[PDB]
Amino acid sequence: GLMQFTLPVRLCKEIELFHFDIGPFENMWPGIFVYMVHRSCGTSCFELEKLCRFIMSVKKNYRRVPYHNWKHAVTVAHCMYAILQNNHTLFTDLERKGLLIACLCHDLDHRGFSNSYLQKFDHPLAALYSTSTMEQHHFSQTVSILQLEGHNIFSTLSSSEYEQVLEIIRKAIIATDLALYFGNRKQLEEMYQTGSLNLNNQSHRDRVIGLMMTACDLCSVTKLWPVTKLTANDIYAEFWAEGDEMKKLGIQPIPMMDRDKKDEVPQGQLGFYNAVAIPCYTTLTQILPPTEPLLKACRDNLSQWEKVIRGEE
Ligand SMILES: Cc1nc2ccccc2nc1CCc1nc(N2CCCC2)nn1C
Ligand SMILES: [Mg+2]
Ligand SMILES: [Zn+2]
């Protein structure tokens, strides 16, 4: 009750910044997450015993893949923490509770393969969930863990509040399907520009939270250049394994997943920053002005990938 989580001075200061790296010490990541819930939500949002037990079951259900692992989960939650803290008054008590949990859970039991590979492999999950295959699985795994004995961190919520928070978590996790991001951001762009965007419209909040989820999920592009560059190695280690698996099924993979096209990585990053990252943090800064450091940091890393192409590294 009177038990605050504190972090060492350097972490206590740097964790407030968008570009914070959670570091290589796995055993501190739960403490980091709790610290963020307490400062973002309150020391009263969750029974500590239940929260800790939930965090550790979530961790257990992330796999040892190069990118879509437990570190990704806590990184994506830290980004969401930075957004919520720099936009204090714009979000309900239920959204603050729900979104940090949604981010921790958003890639639960990921196998390091895209929805496309599941569908071409004919994985059982692809028959159970025809679109956003993995993302419906991730939400499904969230509900599973919430229903384990001693794991209901939402037990104090009313029947209807409980249903509202599970519906926030569901939409938030479905929105991490990048196939959905393009349309979602186009609509938000138009709505902001015609001045029709209304944060009292529940379907408008949904879209805005959806863009935040893309923002947090892509936040590897908003870090210091050495974090960004080294994370890219993990990302491509997954994609190239998937490319290998595509070739095993007798399918030429897309270039992004072909390890034979290593040399084109710098150009592929450019495309991605221009087609996805920049547009994402642009629209997000327009709708939420205090998230501008994500756009600024994204542009800095784009400039770093241009430097790689020019042979300056
Ligand atoms: C999908 C994706 N998500 C990321 C999320 C966060 C940080 C970096 C990310 N990088 C990518 C990969 C971008 C990409 N690479 C290539 N290649 C085509 C030939 C060689 C490389 N094409 N594209 C689109
Ligand atoms: Mg995902
Ligand atoms: Zn993710």
Side-chain angles (χ1 to χ4, degrees):
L2 296 177
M3 269 189 198
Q4 289 311 236
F5 277 68
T6 53
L7 298 174
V9 172
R10 187 196 58 86
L11 282 85
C12 174
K13 292 195 210 175
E14 257 98 317
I15 195 167
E16 293 309 316
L17 310 185
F18 283 97
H19 64 267
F20 185 59
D21 184 80
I22 62 170
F25 300 107
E26 294 210 335
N27 290 164
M28 284 182 74
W29 297 339
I32 287 169
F33 181 72
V34 168
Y35 178 83
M36 292 189 295
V37 167
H38 283 178
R39 280 193 99 263
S40 187
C41 202
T43 66
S44 55
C45 276
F46 303 112
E47 216 255 273
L48 190 54
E49 200 188 299
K50 288 194 165 217
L51 187 51
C52 281
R53 198 155 43 236
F54 180 82
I55 292 171
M56 298 310 286
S57 289
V58 172
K59 173 188 157 77
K60 179 191 297 150
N61 286 286
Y62 276 93
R63 300 173 169 247
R64 292 197 194 88
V65 295
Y67 181 61
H68 285 105
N69 53 39
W70 176 231
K71 193 177 190 166
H72 174 66
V74 174
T75 291
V76 163
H78 157 269
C79 192
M80 173 63 67
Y81 168 78
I83 298 178
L84 292 171
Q85 289 300 259
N86 283 276
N87 302 271
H88 187 56
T89 68
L90 280 89
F91 298 100
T92 60
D93 310 33
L94 277 178
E95 286 166 345
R96 261 180 273 100
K97 266 161 179 167
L99 286 176
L100 285 173
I101 297 301
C103 284
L104 195 68
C105 289
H106 85 278
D107 272 334
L108 262 173
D109 191 40
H110 202 288
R111 322 297 177 96
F113 297 116
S114 72
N115 293 339
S116 289
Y117 176 72
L118 282 231
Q119 294 156 13
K120 262 136 200 155
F121 181 83
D122 202 2
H123 189 281
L125 287 176
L128 186 48
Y129 312 121
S130 31
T131 67
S132 304
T133 300
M134 287 304 301
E135 292 82 16
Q136 297 201 65
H137 182 55
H138 306 316
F139 176 65
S140 180
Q141 294 276 290
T142 310
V143 174
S144 289
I145 287 171
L146 271 174
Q147 275 167 179
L148 263 16
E149 286 233 333
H151 286 63
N152 206 267
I153 54 164
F154 292 128
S155 61
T156 75
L157 275 53
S158 83
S159 194
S160 79
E161 281 192 314
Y162 182 96
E163 171 147 355
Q164 287 185 93
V165 78
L166 260 293
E167 192 66 353
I168 288 167
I169 289 160
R170 188 186 61 81
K171 287 171 201 156
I173 286 177
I174 299 306
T176 62
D177 178 12
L178 205 68
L180 294 184
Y181 146 74
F182 297 103
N184 182 51
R185 190 206 67 89
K186 277 153 198 159
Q187 280 267 244
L188 276 167
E189 199 56 16
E190 290 174 26
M191 283 180 188
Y192 165 83
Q193 274 169 18
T194 73
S196 44
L197 186 63
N198 171 29
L199 287 156
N200 291 308
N201 186 322
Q202 187 52 61
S203 76
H204 286 189
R205 289 182 89 70
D206 289 356
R207 295 207 165 274
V208 164
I209 288 155
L211 189 65
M212 289 165 54
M213 289 297 299
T214 309
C216 296
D217 199 28
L218 297 191
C219 75
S220 143
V221 306
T222 76
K223 300 304 180 181
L224 276 234
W225 168 243
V227 176
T228 299
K229 187 185 168 208
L230 288 169
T231 306
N233 295 336
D234 297 332
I235 292 165
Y236 281 109
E238 287 200 3
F239 289 161
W240 295 338
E242 177 165 331
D244 290 354
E245 288 306 324
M246 284 293 192
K247 288 174 182 169
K248 287 191 192 178
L249 292 175
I251 308 172
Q252 254 302 128
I254 65 174
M256 170 170 121
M257 292 183 181
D258 193 349
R259 65 172 71 258
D260 292 336
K261 288 171 171 154
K262 273 200 189 183
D263 34 293
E264 298 172 46
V265 160
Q267 195 62 52
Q269 288 294 296
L270 277 205
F272 184 71
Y273 277 69
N274 286 312
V276 187
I278 302 291
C280 176
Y281 295 110
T282 303
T283 304
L284 185 67
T285 303
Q286 293 174 172
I287 301 169
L288 299 174
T291 69
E292 193 195 353
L294 295 167
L295 176 55
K296 178 191 178 309
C298 186
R299 277 201 191 283
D300 281 338
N301 285 319
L302 166 64
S303 167
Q304 292 298 289
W305 287 111
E306 286 166 337
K307 278 179 182 172
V308 173
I309 286 155
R310 299 200 290 263
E312 298 170 35
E313 53 189 355

